[PDB]
Design a protein around this ligand. Structure first.
Ligand code: NEF
Ligand code: NEF
Lengths: 13, 13, 13, 13, 13, 13, 13, 13
């Protein structure tokens, strides 16, 4: 089949 | 000093 | 089982 | 002064 | 194929 | 305010 | 406030 | 023909 994974990381000091 | 990361993965059968 | 991967990194000081 | 790096890799088994 | 993603976030005060 | 982030993405066929 | 980001991508045929 | 991509980002104040 088709699998899509998106990972987003946002960093604030 | 904000950091933004985007990761995209696509699976094709 | 074809694989496509995209990585985006953004850093702002 | 912001730095952005993007790398995309596609491969087939 | 089965693709597995692990995300770890650590923040120090 | 140190931040450590680890992300791992793996594919098993 | 030092920041460490780790991204890992693994592809197996 | 396995492909591995690692991205590391380090920010220092
Ligand atoms: O976290 C780990 C240990 C693991 C256990 C299980 C899975 S991975 N992975 C990395 C590795 O082993 O490869 C570590 N990565 C860093 C970093 O943190 O950049 C290192 C620098 C050492 C350092 C640290 C902390 C500080 N600090 O907080 O000041 C300063 C340094 N340094 O640069 O000397 C090298 S060792
Ligand atoms: O740890 C290592 C060495 C490395 C150090 C750093 C990056 S690799 N061993 C590899 C690994 O596990 O990753 C070899 N790979 C595999 C497997 O998949 O378990 C094996 C089976 C068959 C195969 C499938 C795919 C490929 N491929 O994609 O190239 C190659 C082999 N092979 O015959 O070695 C035997 S071991």
């Amino acid at each position: 089949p088709k699998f899509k994974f998106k990972f987003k990381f946002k960093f604030k000091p």
